[PDB]
Design a protein around this ligand. Structure first.
Ligand code: COH
Length: 210
């Protein structure tokens, strides 16, 4: 009863486990630096590119159109942040995908090629709402601990979204307003737990140096 609530309760466990990753613990508690965080955003640009391709394909099908806000696009802003973070655009000629990111990218392409709307909304919820929530905390700890230029953190700032609290409330309303069959609803709820597992292994690779 209530998709936004049912999503938040089903993934509440994995969400708490997502803040406890070894890489993300060291990163926010001041133990790493600008270099390791730049590695995070380089993997992010890889699967955020594959995600928004799936978003574009699902949006063109007319599924969850109001939810797939283009103002949430992160790939270009990441490319603009990686230019500053690397001090040069020559990161594009040497990006590498850790195994878990490749596994994350393959699934997002699978959702794209199947135009799997409900599975897309699951990944859309897990990444973007995390960006609009924990990403605000991650962005602050980057400035506080490492003095990163606030303009190399544009990934965590949404220029189309002034009131983040209002928008996150508006986002959950569109989640509750989605017209999903019981088959679609379970498929979405399962992929959401899958989406957290995909991210968890991305951060396990980062902490392992893969
Ligand atoms: C340092 C804190 C921190 C970290 C590292 C973090 C890391 C991640 C992460 C990395 C793997 C992912 C995929 C997410 C994904 C999410 N986070 Co956070 N989150 C964090 C603090 C929060 C906070 C605070 C909220 C607000 C709601 C809540 O339940 O706490 C949050 C909410 C979310 C939501 C929305 C829940 C809802 O309202 O339905 C998603 C999705 N997330 N988060």
């Amino acid at each position: 009863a209530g998709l936004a609530v049912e999503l938040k309760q089903s993934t509440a466990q994995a969400c708490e486990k997502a803040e406890h990753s070894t890489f993300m613990s060291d990163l926010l508690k001041g133990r790493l630096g600008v270099a390791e965080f730049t590695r995070l955003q380089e993997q992010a640009w890889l699967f955020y590119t594959a995600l928004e391709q799936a978003v574009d394909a699902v949006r063109a099908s007319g599924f969850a159109e109001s939810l797939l806000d283009p103002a949430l696009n992160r790939a270009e802003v990441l490319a603009r942040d990686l230019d500053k973070l690397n001090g040069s655009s020559e990161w594009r000629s040497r990006i590498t995908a850790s195994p878990a990111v490749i596994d994350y990218v393959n699934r997002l392409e699978e959702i794209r090629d199947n135009v799997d709307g409900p599975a897309l909304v699951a990944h859309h919820y897990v990444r973007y709402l995390g960006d609009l929530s924990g990403g605000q905390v991650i962005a602050r700890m980057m400035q506080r601990h490492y003095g990163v230029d606030p303009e190399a953190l544009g990934f965590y700032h949404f220029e189309g979204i002034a009131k983040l609290k209002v928008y996150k409330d508006e986002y959950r309303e569109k989640l509750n307003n989605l017209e999903l069959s019981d088959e679609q609803r379970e498929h979405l709820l399962k992929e959401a737990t899958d989406a957290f597992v995909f991210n968890h292994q991305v951060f396990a690779d980062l902490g392992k140096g893969l």
